[PDB]
Coordinates of C-alpha atoms and ligand atoms in Angstrom, one line a residue:
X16 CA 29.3 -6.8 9.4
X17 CA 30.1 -8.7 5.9
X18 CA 30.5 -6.1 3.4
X19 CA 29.8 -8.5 0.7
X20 CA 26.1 -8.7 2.3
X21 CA 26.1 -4.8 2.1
X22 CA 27.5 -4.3 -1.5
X23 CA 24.6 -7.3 -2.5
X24 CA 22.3 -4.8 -0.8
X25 CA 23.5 -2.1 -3.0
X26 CA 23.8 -4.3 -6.6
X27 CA 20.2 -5.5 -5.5
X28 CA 18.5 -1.9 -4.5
X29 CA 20.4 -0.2 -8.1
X30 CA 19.0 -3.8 -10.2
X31 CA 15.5 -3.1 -9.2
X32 CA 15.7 0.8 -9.6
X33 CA 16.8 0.4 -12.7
X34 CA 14.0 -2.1 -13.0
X35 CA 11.5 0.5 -11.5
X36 CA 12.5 3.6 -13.9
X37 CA 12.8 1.4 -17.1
X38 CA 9.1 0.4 -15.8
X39 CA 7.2 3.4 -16.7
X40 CA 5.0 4.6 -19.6
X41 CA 5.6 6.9 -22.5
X42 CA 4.7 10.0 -20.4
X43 CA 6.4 8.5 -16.8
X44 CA 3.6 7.0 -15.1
X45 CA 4.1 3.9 -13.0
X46 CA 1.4 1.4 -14.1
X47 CA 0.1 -1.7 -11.9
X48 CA -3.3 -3.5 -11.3
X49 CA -5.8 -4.3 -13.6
X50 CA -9.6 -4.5 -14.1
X51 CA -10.2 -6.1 -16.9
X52 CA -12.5 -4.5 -19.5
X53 CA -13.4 -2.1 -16.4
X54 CA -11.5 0.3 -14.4
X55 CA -8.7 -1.1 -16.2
X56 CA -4.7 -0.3 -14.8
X57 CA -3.6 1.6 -11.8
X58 CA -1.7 4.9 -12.3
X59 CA -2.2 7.9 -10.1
X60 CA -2.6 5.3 -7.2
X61 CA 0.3 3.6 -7.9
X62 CA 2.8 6.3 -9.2
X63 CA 2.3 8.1 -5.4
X64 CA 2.9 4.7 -4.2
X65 CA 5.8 4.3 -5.8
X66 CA 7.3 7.6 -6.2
X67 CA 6.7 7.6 -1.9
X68 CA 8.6 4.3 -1.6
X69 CA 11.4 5.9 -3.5
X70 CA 12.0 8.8 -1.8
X71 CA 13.7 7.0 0.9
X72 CA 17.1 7.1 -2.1
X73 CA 19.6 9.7 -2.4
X74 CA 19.9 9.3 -6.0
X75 CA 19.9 12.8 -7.6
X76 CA 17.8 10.5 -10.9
X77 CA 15.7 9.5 -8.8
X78 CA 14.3 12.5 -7.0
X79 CA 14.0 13.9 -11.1
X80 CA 12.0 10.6 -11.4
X81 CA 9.8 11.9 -8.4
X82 CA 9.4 15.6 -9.4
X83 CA 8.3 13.8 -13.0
X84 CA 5.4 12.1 -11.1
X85 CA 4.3 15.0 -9.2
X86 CA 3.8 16.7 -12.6
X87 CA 1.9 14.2 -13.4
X88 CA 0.0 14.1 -10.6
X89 CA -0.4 18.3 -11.1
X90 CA -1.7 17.8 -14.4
X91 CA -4.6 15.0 -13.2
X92 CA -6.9 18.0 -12.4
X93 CA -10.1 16.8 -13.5
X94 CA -11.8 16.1 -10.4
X95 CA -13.5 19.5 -8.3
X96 CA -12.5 18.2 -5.0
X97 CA -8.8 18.6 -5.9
X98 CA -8.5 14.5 -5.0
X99 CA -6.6 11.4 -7.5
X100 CA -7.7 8.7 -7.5
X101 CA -6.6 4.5 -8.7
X102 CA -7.0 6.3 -12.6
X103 CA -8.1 8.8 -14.5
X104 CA -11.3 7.4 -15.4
X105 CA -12.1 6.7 -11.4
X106 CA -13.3 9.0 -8.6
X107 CA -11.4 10.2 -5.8
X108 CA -10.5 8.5 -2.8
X109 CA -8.4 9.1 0.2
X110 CA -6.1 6.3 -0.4
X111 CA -4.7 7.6 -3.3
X112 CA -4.7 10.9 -2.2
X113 CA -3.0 10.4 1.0
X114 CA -0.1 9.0 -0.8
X115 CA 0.1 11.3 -3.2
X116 CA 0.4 14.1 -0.3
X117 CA 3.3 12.1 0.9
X118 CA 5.1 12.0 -2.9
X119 CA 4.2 16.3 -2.6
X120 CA 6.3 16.3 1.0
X121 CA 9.0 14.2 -0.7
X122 CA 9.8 16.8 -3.6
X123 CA 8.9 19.9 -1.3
X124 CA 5.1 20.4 -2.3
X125 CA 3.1 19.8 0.5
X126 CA 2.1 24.0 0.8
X127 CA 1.5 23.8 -3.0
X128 CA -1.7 25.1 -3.7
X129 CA -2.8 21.4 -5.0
X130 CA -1.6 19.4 -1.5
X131 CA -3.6 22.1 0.3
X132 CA -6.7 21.9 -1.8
X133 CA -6.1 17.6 -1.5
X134 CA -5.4 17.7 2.0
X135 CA -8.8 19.9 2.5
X136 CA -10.5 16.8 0.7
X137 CA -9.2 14.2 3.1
X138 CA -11.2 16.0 5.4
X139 CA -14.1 15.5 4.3
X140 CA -13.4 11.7 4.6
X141 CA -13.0 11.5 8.1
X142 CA -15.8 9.4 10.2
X143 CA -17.4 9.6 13.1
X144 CA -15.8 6.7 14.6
X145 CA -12.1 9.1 14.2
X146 CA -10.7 7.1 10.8
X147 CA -10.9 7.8 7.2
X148 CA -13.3 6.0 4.6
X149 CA -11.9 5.5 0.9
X150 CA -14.8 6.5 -0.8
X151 CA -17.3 9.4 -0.5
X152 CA -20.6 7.2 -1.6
X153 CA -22.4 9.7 -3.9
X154 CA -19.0 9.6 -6.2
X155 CA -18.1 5.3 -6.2
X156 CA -22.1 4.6 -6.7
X157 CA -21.9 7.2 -9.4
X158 CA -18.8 5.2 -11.2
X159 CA -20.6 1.8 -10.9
X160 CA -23.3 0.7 -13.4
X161 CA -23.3 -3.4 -11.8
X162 CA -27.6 -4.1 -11.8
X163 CA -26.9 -6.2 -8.7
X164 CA -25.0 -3.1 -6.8
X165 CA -27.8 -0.5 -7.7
X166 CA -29.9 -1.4 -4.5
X167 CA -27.0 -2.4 -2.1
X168 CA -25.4 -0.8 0.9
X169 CA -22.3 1.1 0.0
X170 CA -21.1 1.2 3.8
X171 CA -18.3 -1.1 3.2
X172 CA -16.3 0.6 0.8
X173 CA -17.3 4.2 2.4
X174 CA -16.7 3.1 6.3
X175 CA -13.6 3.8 8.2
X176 CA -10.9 1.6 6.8
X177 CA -7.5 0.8 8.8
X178 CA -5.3 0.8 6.1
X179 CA -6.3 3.7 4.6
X180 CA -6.1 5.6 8.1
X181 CA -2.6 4.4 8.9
X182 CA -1.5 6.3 5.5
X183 CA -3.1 9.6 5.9
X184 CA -1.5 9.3 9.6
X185 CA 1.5 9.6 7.9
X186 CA 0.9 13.0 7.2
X187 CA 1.7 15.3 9.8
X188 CA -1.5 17.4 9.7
X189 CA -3.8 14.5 9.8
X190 CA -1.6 12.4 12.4
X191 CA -3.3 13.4 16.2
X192 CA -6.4 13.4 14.5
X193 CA -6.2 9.7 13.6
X194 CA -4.3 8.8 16.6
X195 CA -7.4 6.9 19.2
X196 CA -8.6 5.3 15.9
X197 CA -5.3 4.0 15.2
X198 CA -4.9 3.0 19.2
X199 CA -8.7 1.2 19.6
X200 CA -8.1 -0.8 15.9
X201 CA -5.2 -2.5 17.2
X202 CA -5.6 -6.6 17.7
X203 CA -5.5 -8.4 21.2
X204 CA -2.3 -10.0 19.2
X205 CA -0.4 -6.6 18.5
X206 CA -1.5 -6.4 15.1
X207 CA -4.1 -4.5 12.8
X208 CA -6.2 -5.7 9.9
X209 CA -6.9 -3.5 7.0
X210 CA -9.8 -3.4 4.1
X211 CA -8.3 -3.6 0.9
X212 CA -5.4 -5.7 1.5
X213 CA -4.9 -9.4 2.2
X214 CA -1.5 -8.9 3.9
X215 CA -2.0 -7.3 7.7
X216 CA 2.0 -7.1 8.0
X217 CA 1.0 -3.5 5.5
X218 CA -1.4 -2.3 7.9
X219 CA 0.6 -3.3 10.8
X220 CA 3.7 -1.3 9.8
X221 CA 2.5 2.0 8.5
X222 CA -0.2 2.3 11.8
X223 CA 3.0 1.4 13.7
X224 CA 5.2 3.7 11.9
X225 CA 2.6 6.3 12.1
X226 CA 2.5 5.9 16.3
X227 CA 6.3 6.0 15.9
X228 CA 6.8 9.4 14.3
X229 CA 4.0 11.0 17.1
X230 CA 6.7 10.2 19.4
X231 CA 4.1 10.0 22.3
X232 CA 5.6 7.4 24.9
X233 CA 2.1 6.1 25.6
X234 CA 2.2 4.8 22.6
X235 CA 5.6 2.8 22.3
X236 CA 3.7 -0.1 24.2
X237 CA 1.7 -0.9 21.1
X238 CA 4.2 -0.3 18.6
X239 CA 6.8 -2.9 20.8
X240 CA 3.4 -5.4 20.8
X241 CA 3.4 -4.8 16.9
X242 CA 6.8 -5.9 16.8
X243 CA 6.7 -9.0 18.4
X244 CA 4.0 -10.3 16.4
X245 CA 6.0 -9.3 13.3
X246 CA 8.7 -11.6 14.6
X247 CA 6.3 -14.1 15.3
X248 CA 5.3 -13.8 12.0
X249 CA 9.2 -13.9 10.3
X250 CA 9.9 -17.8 10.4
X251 CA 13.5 -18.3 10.9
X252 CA 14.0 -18.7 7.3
X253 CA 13.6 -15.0 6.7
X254 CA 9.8 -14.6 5.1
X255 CA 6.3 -14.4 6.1
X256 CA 4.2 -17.1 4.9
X257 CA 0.8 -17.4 3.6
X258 CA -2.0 -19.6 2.5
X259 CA -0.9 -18.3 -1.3
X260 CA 2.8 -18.6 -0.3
X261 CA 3.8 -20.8 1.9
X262 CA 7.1 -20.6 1.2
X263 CA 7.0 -16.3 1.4
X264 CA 5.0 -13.6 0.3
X265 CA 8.1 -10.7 -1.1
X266 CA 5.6 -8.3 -0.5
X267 CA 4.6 -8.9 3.4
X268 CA 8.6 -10.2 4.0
X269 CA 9.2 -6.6 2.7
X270 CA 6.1 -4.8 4.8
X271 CA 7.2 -6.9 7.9
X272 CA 10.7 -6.0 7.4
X273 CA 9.7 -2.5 8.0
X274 CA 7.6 -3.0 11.3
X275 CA 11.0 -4.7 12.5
X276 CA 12.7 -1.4 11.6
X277 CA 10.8 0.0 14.7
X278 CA 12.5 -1.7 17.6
X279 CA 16.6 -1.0 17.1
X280 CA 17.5 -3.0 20.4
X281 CA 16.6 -6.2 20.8
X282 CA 19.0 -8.7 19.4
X283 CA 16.6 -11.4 18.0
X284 CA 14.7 -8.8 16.2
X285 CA 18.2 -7.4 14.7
X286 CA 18.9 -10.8 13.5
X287 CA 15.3 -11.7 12.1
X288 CA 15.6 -8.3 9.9
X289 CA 18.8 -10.1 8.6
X290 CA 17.3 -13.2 8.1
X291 CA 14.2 -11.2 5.8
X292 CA 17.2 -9.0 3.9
X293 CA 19.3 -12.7 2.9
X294 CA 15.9 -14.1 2.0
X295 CA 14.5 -11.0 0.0
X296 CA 18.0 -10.8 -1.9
X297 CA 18.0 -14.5 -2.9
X298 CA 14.4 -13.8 -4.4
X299 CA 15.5 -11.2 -6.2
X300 CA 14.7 -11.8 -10.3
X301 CA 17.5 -11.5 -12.9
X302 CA 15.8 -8.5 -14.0
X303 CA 15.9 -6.1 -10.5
X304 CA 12.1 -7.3 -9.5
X305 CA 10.6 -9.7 -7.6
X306 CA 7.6 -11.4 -7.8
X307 CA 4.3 -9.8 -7.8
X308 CA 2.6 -10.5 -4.4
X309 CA 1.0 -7.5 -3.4
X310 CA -2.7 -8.9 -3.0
X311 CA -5.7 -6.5 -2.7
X312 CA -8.8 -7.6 -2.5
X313 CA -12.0 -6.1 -3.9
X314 CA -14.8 -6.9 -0.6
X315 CA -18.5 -6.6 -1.7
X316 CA -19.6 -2.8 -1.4
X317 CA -21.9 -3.6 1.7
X318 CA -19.2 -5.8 3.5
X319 CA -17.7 -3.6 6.5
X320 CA -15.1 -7.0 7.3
X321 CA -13.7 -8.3 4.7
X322 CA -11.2 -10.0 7.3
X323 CA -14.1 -12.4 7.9
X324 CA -15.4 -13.1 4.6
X325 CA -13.9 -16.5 4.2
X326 CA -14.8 -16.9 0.1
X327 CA -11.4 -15.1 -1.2
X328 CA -10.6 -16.0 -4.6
X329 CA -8.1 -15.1 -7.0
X330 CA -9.4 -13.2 -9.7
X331 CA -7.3 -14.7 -12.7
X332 CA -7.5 -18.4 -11.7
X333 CA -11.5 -18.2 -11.3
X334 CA -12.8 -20.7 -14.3
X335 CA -16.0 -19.7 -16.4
X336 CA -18.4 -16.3 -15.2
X337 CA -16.8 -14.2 -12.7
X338 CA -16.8 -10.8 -11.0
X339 CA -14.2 -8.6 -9.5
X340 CA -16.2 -8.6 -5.4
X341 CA -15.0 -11.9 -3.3
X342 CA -11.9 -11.7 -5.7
X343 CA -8.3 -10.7 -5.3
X344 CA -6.0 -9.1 -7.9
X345 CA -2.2 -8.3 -8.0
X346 CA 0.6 -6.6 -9.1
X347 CA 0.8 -8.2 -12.7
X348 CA 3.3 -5.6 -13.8
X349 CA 5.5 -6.3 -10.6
X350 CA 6.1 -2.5 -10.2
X351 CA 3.8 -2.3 -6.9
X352 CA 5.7 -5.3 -5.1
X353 CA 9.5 -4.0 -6.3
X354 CA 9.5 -0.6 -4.8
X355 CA 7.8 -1.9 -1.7
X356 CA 11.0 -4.7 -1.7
X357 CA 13.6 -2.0 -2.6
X358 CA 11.9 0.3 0.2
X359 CA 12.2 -2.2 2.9
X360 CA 15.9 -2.5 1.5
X361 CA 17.3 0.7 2.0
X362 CA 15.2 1.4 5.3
X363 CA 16.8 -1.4 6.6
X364 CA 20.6 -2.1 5.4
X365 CA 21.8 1.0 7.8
X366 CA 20.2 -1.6 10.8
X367 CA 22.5 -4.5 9.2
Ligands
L4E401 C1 -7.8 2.0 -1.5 C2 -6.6 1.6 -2.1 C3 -6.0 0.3 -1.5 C4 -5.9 2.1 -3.2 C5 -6.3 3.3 -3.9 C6 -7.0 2.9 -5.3 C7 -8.2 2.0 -5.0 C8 -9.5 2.7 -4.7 C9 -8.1 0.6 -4.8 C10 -9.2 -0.4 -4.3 C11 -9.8 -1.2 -5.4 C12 -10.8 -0.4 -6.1 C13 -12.2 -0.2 -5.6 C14 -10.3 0.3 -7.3 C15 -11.2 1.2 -8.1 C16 -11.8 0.6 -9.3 C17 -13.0 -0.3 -8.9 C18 -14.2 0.5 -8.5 C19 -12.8 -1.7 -8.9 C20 -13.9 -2.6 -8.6 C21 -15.0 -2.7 -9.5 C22 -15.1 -2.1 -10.8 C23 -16.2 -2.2 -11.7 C24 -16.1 -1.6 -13.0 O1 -15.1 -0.9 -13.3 O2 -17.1 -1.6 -13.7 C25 -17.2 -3.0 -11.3 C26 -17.3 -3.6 -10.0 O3 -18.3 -4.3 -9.7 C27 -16.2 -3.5 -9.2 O4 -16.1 -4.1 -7.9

């Protein structure tokens, strides 16, 4: 063990909480993502995000930060199904909500009146195929006024999605429910592919992690294949690359980091989590973030695999007319990417 590589772990975790806490809004929201002259920036989504990916600190100012955002949360009441949503001005969905449910357990709300009427809403989401859909139709085709959408399928953004399922797995109530979805999703290569996001390494870890904390041996065969391909997808430098960053996506180093957090015996996968910590502290910005990777991607409402539409393009490179479906948007505020780095950080020092 070189303690200089664990006191860098702690200067580089406090640099980018202080980062995180300076980061928010006059009232204490967490802010990232944007639509421009649209659904605008992210809140409710990404404050449960964030606040969840912080739990994991002992820091007495940071559970304060987190009992903040579940007021906040409390007081975003607006919608009758009890569910948040990516903003105020946007419908529910069970993304947000199944995050936020995880910031409730984190600061001792889960029987609070709210998680229970928000947990009832998941529900409601669930599909015939055993996962959970995003959207509830009637509600996102009531939020969009695109001519061109008016006529089309919504099945895409209101079908089973992967990603979304492997969250609400990570509550307890929901996780047996989700559990032969979670098992028939998985890839002949050990992975799993989500909807909204580019990066499968955040898909890959939380269904993992969500077949982990069932503790059903059956199950510890797929989570060991989901490991493998994680180190096959850590190069020996210590990152994931991607077509946008070949030299290492922060924000699937940090998500992969975490699937390799799942397997606490094997000796090469011990020394690929060191390799992704030296790499992910040499990133690090002078200012306690890194840089914004976390890529989601907005499909066409009618497209149910967005894994093989091959047109990707980043939204704020696209030259001349352009529209948010076939696009992908970030983390411009860096907030979303950080606390997923810092997470992977703390989760994973102990493991050093
Ligand atoms: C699910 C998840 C990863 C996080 C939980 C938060 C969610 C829901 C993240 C996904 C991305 C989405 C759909 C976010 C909502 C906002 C929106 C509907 C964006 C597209 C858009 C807007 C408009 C418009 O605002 O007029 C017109 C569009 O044609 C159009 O595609």
């Amino acid at each position: 063990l070189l303690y200089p590589k664990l006191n860098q772990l702690s200067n580089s975790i406090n640099a980018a909480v202080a980062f995180l806490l300076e980061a928010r809004n006059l009232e204490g929201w967490w802010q990232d993502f944007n639509f421009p002259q649209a659904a605008s920036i992210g809140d409710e989504w990404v404050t449960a995000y964030v606040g969840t990916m912080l739990a994991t600190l002992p820091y007495a100012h940071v559970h304060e930060a987190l009992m903040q955002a579940w007021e906040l949360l409390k007081i975003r009441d607006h919608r009758p199904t009890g569910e948040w949503g990516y903003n105020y001005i946007l419908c529910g969905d069970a993304n947000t909500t199944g995050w936020a449910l995880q910031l409730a357990a984190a600061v001792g709300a889960s029987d609070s009146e709210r998680a229970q009427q928000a947990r009832a809403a998941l529900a409601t989401h669930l599909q015939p195929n055993g996962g959970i859909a995003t959207f509830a139709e009637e509600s996102i085709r009531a939020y969009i006024k695109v001519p061109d959408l008016a006529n089309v399928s919504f099945q895409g953004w209101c079908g089973a999605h992967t990603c979304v399922s492997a969250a609400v797995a990570a509550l307890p109530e929901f996780r047996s429910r989700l559990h032969d979805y979670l098992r028939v999703t998985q890839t002949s290569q050990g992975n799993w592919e989500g909807y909204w996001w580019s990066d499968h390494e955040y898909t890959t870890a939380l269904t993992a992690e969500a077949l982990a904390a069932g503790g059903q041996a059956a199950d510890q065969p797929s989570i060991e294949q989901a490991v493998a391909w994680g180190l096959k997808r850590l190069c020996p430098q210590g990152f994931v690359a991607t077509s946008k960053h070949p030299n290492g996506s922060t924000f699937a180093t940090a998500w992969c980091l975490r699937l390799l957090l799942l397997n606490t015996v094997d000796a090469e996968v011990k020394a690929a989590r060191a390799a992704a910590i030296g790499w992910l502290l040499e990133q690090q910005r002078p200012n306690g973030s890194w840089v914004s990777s976390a890529y989601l991607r907005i499909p066409y409402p009618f497209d149910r695999n967005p894994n093989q539409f091959p047109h990707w393009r980043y939204y704020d490179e696209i030259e001349g007319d352009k529209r948010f479906e076939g696009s992908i948007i970030f983390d411009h505020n860096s907030i979303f990417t950080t606390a997923t780095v810092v997470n992977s950080l703390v989760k994973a020092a102990p493991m050093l």
